[PDB]
């Protein structure tokens, strides 16, 4: 994939060389969009709109951290969705990762969640927001096994996905019209690199096959069901809502 890689970390070590060689980066200097790797994180730039700065992924602090404290938690609609209920922790599969948000508060919950990012530029963002989250002394511990990041399609490695777990999370990109939804800098970004995904429909049967008990989709209001499938269950939040399928039943169950 190409991208404006940027070095901003003055070590002269090759690192950003060995980053993109890692994620099958390309550099591209012509690339509307950059990756920066800062002395601290590695971070996104839409390259004509320096007035809307980096966007990175941050576990331990920032937006997250108060998100952790004032979202809800277990009592996040998104937390409802999954089924988290009294002692049930549902072992998660985030199928459409994007900057860990969902993903984190289901695992500061206490489920164990999975991610999965095809996106390479992407899957580098997370990944350093994981080494990052892996040495904090609070969360660190928990978070490298409650939170962890797969590199690949979620319409192809998501049946090959093992142990299966008991819920399926989907948030794809949707074609976001509204511009009240490109006001702020983390989506005008974010959307600027990967776009709607053209393909989201075809997430649900898969997500369907590997989850056992639940497959949740977050869709913004008034946006019809993915792939068309209705459903009458569905938490209505403000501004999305969560229509939720079921999954499929166990087959050799040891």
């Not at 060995?18 to 509307?32: C, F, I, M, S, Y």
């Not at 530029?121 to 927001?129: E, F, N």
């Not at 998501?158 to 006001?183: E, G």
Request: glycine residues 10%.
């Amino acid at each position: 994939m190409q991208i404006c890689l940027m070095d901003e970390t003055g070590a002269t070590d090759g690192a950003l060389s060995v980053l993109a060689a890692r994620w099958g980066l390309e550099h591209d200097e012509d690339n509307p969009m950059a990756l920066v790797m800062t002395p601290q994180h590695l971070e996104l730039r839409k390259r004509d709109e320096p007035k809307l700065g980096g966007i990175f992924v941050d576990f331990v602090g920032g937006a997250m951290a108060h998100r952790r404290k004032f979202g809800g938690g277990r009592g996040e609609a998104v937390a409802k969705a999954v089924g988290i209920k009294g002692d049930y922790l549902p072992d998660v599969v985030d199928a459409t990762a994007g900057l860990g948000r969902d993903a984190f508060v289901l695992a500061s919950v206490g489920c164990r969640v999975r991610m999965l990012e095809r996106n390479p530029v992407v899957a580098a963002l997370l990944d350093d927001g994981l080494t990052r989250g892996y040495a904090d002394a609070d969360i660190g511990g928990w978070l490298q096994e409650r939170l962890q990041l797969i590199h690949a399609s979620s319409l192809t490695a998501l049946t090959d996905i093992t142990p299966r777990p008991q819920v399926v999370y989907l948030d794809p990109m949707f074609p976001h019209r509204q511009k009240s939804a490109l006001v702020k800098k983390e989506m005008r970004v974010f959307q600027s690199l990967v776009g709607p995904d053209l393909d989201a429909d075809g997430l649900l049967e898969p997500a369907r096959q590997l989850a056992t008990k639940r497959v949740v989709v977050k869709r913004p209001d008034y946006a019809p069901p993915l792939a068309d499938v209705a459903t009458p269950n569905a938490i209505v939040t403000k501004g999305h809502r969560f229509d939720i399928y079921a999954g499929t039943p166990l087959t050799e169950l040891e």
